[PDB]
RNA sequence: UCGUGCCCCGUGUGGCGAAAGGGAAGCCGGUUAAUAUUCCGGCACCUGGAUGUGGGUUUUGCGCGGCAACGCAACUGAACGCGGAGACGACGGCGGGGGCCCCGGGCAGAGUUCUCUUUUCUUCUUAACGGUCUAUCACCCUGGAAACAGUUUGUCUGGAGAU
RNA sequence: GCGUGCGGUUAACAACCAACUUAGAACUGGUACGGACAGGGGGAAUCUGACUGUCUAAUUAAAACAUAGCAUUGCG
């Protein structure tokens, strides 16, 4: 793993217009299931180009342009705060406060779904990969699509070599001994 | 219709001279024993002028308005046409066939062009084919 | 409807296939259509735009691919975009 | 020649992991392994690299799609509800 | 005949850097030559092809060699290769082109904006 | 080391000023002789077919040049 | 020069940590009782610095040639940027090259020889560093392919231009 | 020694060079013929753990542990 999986961080383009980004690379990233996305975009106030790292949704490719800000298309790929975007719409990488460059549905084939507006306090209901409901305000970013990747689990792992293969990258215990399979000095359920 | 015409200004794109602007002097679309294909020979641009500013002195400026011209033989594959024209009748026949393959007779047609195309550099006319192509 | 005018031009008149042929009927001006299919590369399309508006040549955008694009002329291998010289019996042109 | 009766791309696990769990790997194998058209140069020639990421050989281009198969029906109907609700959103 | 052979650095393990032909010296004996790692042909900056003229060295082998050597006599040569230039040239000229035929069209969009509200 | 094909530029290298000495080698199963000079940098040798013009050579060769024959044994 | 100031830029923060990772450059012959890619002889290379000579460029000021892929002993290039190299898994068969093994002829030497064996065995070698001529992939030019073609042990390639 | 315009697919022919497999037949010795070496005993069932794998170094290698699959709980 290179860098997070993070948006830019909201600034005065991303407020009140859009930027373009072009897509250069879509990148396997050890640990995760979804694959990443390079993005490199324009710096406003110098010559040096800046390049990000996102979570890449479906349908997204290299040498493609995306744009991120507040009059973005409603296209896959494009990062719109929330109140841009009409109900019922999927997004991805949903940030749960405005610059926190994304906090939900990030793994895998999920996404959220924005149930509705409501314009007078400015916030946003949406719908989480869990069936939960919450609110967030409504300058949240999150980026048009499905996030890429969909169908991970539905595949058998088949193999203790290949559960070993997932969780060595991913740090997880394993293989993972039973409690009552343990001792009493080592386990509540030992015995 | 036709448009790879006499004064007509395409852009090359492959060899030394790409991404150079030329004017085409003698379009034969029907080649020749030494080029069996459809190729042009033109005059262009090697080395553009350089930006003047409303403070340079004048000696500054006369060194900065110089252009480095060439002559080229080229295929119509290795060149990107353009809706702009450049009209020179001193550029009128300056190339043949015959020009490329006599040393001297290139360097003449080279100052030939030299002297045309800086004429009309400082004349301020067609500034697009005086501006190099950025990419 | 543009499928049958096009396989009747296949029948009756002469057309090129491919962009190398479509850029040498373009140079050579007796073009009299320009087909680009809908999944041409962007670059290329333009260019062919750019040919035929300096040609006076006019361009029709198929909405099939280049696999399509083939069938309809009635080949068995893709085409990006082609040229029509002579109408034929066709009145593709008339459009 | 037909070598196998039923279980295909899933002859190398022998006669482990038990038929249910067999036959459901077969189906991913299959179309993870299987070739692709491009929907850019129309060749077929998109393979899998790796998870989620479908590169085509010709134009060298790399596209981002589910873990075993280049399109998703959720991504499909999904690309669907976000046209109609664009023409809304524009008209 | 000894045809068995040591090696001549105190490194006894098959690394990448510890690479050894067989040579047969004018003593008439059999022995090894340490030798370096094969030098990598310059790639595309664009596609990743091999750049065609440009010998595969070391990073620092580039530096005893003369400027026509490691380079092409052309717009990025040496950088790029010939395909992806003439793309960058006709890209570049088509988007610029564009760029002319927009501003022309929203002048004359704005002239009659103007016309309708004068 | 490097091999001189022209007569004029070793002719010219022999009367550079780090040529600090010459020899002459005859291989008479080949039937050739060789004119080495010992430059700074590079051992330069010139390859000819055993003949008296080539012997004649060591007279427009330059006499401040110390110029010896090869021996039979290179006795150490 | 109101002479004792003004302008530009943002990227941060140091050190240790691998005689198997990365990495600038040396080969052959001989030599000691004991060291040797270290010594001796011959023949090289790398890094850095200073400053000459020849050659090159230039009165069309910063080269010329090739349609092109590109080539040629040179052939200006600060700030600021872009890219490449360094820089990369495991396994399977296929092809090229070096070394080794094996077969035949020849010179020289050695052994066998009651009988046979034009016999059996041994030496027959060529380094680093350079020049020059060539070597799969790939790329370029012409041209436009169905009666589809080319092609690998392995079925891939081609109007996005194949043979 | 090359450039065209033709004409022909019995080269289905000549010359030179080359190595290892496979099959078939006769003859012949025999107490032995993978002659030493090298090298699965096989089968009918029962219990048991799915399998590959791991542990009590120095008395226990296993129906123990792990494993893939399955089920439940908590967390925006
Ligand atoms: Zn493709
Ligand atoms: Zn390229």
Redesign the pocket.
């Known amino acids: 793993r290179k860098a997070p999986a993070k948006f830019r961080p909201l600034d005065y383009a991303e407020r009140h217009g859009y930027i373009r980004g072009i897509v250069?690379e879509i990148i396997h990233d050890p640990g995760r299931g979804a694959p990443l996305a390079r993005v490199?975009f324009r710096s406003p106030?110098?010559?040096?180009?800046i390049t990000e790292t996102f979570i890449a949704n479906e349908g997204m490719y290299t040498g493609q342009f995306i744009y991120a800000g507040k009059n973005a298309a409603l296209t896959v790929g494009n990062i719109l705060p929330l109140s841009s975007v009409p109900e019922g719409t999927v997004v991805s990488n949903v940030e749960?406060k405005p610059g926190d460059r994304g906090?939900?549905?990030?793994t895998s084939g999920n996404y959220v779904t924005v149930v509705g507006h409501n314009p007078d306090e400015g916030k946003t209901r949406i719908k989480?990969?869990?069936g939960?409901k919450?609110v967030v305000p409504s300058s949240s970013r999150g980026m048009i699509g499905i996030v890429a990747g969909g169908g991970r689990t539905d595949k058998?792992?088949?193999?203790?070599?290949?559960?070993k293969h997932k969780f060595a990258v991913k740090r997880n215990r394993?293989?993972?001994?039973?409690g009552v399979?343990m001792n009493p000095v080592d386990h509540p359920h030992g015995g | 219709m036709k448009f790879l015409k006499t004064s007509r200004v395409c852009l090359?794109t492959?060899?030394?001279?790409?991404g150079k602007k030329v004017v085409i002097i003698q379009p034969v679309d029907q080649?020749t024993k030494?080029?069996?294909?459809?190729?042009a020979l033109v005059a262009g641009i090697?080395?553009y002028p350089s930006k003047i500013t409303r403070r340079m002195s004048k000696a500054r400026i006369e060194?900065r308005s110089?252009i480095?011209?060439?002559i080229?033989?080229?295929?119509?594959?290795?060149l990107m046409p353009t809706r702009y024209t450049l009209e020179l009748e001193g550029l009128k026949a300056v190339i043949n066939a015959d020009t490329?393959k006599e040393?001297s007779q290139?360097?003449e047609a080279?100052?030939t062009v030299?002297k045309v195309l800086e004429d009309r550099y400082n004349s301020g006319k067609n500034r697009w084919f005086f501006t190099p192509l950025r990419f | 409807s543009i499928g049958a005018k096009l396989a009747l031009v296949i029948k009756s008149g002469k057309v090129?296939?491919?962009?190398?042929?479509?850029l040498?009927a373009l140079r050579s001006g007796k073009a009299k259509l320009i087909l680009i299919?809908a999944?041409?590369?962007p670059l290329?399309k333009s260019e062919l735009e750019y040919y035929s508006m300096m040609s006076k040549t006019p361009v029709h955008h198929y909405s099939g691919t280049?696999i399509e694009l083939?069938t309809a002329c009635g080949?068995?291998?893709?085409?990006?975009?082609?040229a029509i010289l002579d109408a034929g019996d066709s009145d593709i042109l008339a459009d | 020649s037909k070598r196998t009766k039923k279980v295909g791309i899933s002859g190398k696990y022998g006669?482990?992991?038990?038929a249910s769990?067999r036959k459901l790997v077969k189906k991913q194998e299959v179309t993870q392994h299987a070739?692709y058209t491009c929907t850019?140069?129309?060749?077929?020639?998109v393979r899998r690299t790796a998870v989620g990421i479908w590169s085509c050989?010709?134009?060298k281009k790399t596209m981002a799609g589910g873990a075993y198969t280049v399109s998703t029906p959720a991504a499909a109907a999904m690309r669907s509800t976000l046209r109609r609700l664009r023409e809304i959103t524009e008209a | 005949?000894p045809?068995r052979v040591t090696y001549?650095?105190?490194?006894?393990?098959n690394?990448?850097?510890?690479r050894t032909?067989?040579?047969?010296?004018?003593?008439?004996?059999?022995?090894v030559?340490?030798i370096?790692?094969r030098?990598?042909?310059?790639?595309?900056?664009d596609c990743?092809?091999?750049?065609?003229?440009?010998p595969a060295?070391?990073?620092?082998?580039?530096?005893?060699i003369?400027?026509?050597?490691k380079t092409?006599?052309?717009a990025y040569?040496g950088?790029?290769?010939?395909?992806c230039v003439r793309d960058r040239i006709i890209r570049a000229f088509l988007i610029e082109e564009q760029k002319i035929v927009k501003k022309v069209l929203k002048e004359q969009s704005q002239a009659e904006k103007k016309a309708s509200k004068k | 080391?490097?091999?001189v094909s022209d007569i004029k530029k070793f002719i010219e290298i022999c009367r550079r000023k780090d040529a600090s000495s010459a020899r002459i080698k005859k291989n008479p199963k080949t039937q050739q002789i060789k004119f080495?000079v010992?430059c700074q940098?590079?051992?330069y040798t010139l390859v000819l077919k055993d003949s008296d013009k080539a012997e004649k050579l060591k007279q427009s060769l330059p006499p401040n040049l110390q110029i010896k024959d090869v021996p039979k044994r290179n006795k150490?």
Do not use: D
Not at chain 1, 45 to 49: I, S, V
Not at chain 1, 103 to 106: E, H, I, M, T, V
Not at chain 5, 66 to 69: A, V
């Open positions: 250069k490199v106030y110098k010559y040096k180009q749960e906090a939900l549905g990030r989480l990969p869990s939960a919450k058998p792992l088949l193999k203790a070599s290949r559960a394993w293989p993972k001994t039973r399979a | 090359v492959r060899g030394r001279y790409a080649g030494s080029h069996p294909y459809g190729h090697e080395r060194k110089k480095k011209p060439f080229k033989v080229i295929n119509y594959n290795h490329f040393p290139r360097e080279k100052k030299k | 090129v296939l491919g962009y190398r042929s479509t040498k299919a999944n041409t590369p290329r280049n083939g080949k068995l291998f893709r085409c990006s975009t082609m | 006669t482990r992991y038990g769990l070739r850019f140069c129309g060749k077929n020639s050989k010709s134009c | 005949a045809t001549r650095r105190r490194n006894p393990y690394t990448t850097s510890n032909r067989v040579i047969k010296t004018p003593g008439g004996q059999l022995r030559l340490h370096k790692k030098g990598t042909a310059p790639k595309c900056g990743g092809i091999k750049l065609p003229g440009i060295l070391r990073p620092r082998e580039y530096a005893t003369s400027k026509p050597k092409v006599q052309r040569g950088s790029r290769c010939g395909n | 080391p490097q091999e080495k010992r940098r590079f051992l150490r």
